[PDB]
């Protein structure tokens, strides 16, 4: 809602992503893969070389991914808050139907002969 803000203040009333979020685990995995590719293109032992470098790949991805996931969750909360409030403001456009049962509704039968 706030102009050119990555995370408006109201976003703090939502629960933050857990640090065991499955989406966050995937992002951390992508950082691990990036670390491996870095060793491979530079012709270093892929698994062993530069564990300090590999750690920072995992850490940076998880750090950025945590905030992206938080904004992602925030934008979907905002979408629903907007959508439900609009429905409340315009009842005549979203009228509750009278729900007929299947014993009353006539559906045509199409034999598979």
């Amino acid at each position: 809602r706030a102009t050119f803000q990555f995370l408006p203040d109201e976003a703090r009333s939502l629960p933050p992503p857990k640090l065991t979020d499955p989406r966050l685990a995937f992002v951390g995995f992508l950082g691990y893969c990036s670390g491996l590719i870095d060793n491979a293109i530079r012709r270093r032992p892929v698994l062993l070389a530069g564990l300090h470098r590999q750690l920072l790949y995992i850490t940076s991805f998880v750090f950025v991914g945590y905030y992206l996931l938080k904004r992602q969750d925030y934008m979907y909360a905002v979408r629903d808050h907007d959508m439900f409030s609009y429905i409340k403001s315009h009842p005549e456009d979203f009228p509750e139907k009278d729900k007929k049962t299947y014993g009353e509704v006539f559906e045509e039968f199409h034999p598979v002969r």
Partner: protein, 63 residues
């Protein structure tokens, strides 16, 4: 798994997918109305901010 667990796990799955399905339909109709009438948070294309206007007395009166 016993039939009862799978049976009632299915009802839980169907509830979530039915609720999501209804919201998907509702969002399409809300989007249709908001865009056509411009009376909601979405499709709110900016107009000139009125705080830019200067209301001070001018060099001439008729303005």
């Amino acid at each position: 798994d016993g039939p009862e667990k799978n049976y009632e796990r299915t009802m839980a799955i169907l509830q979530i997918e039915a609720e999501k399905a209804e919201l998907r339909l509702k969002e399409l109709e809300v989007r249709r109305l908001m865009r056509a009438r411009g009376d909601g948070p979405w499709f709110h294309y900016p107009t000139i901010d009125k705080e830019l206007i200067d209301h001070s007395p001018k060099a001439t009166p008729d303005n």
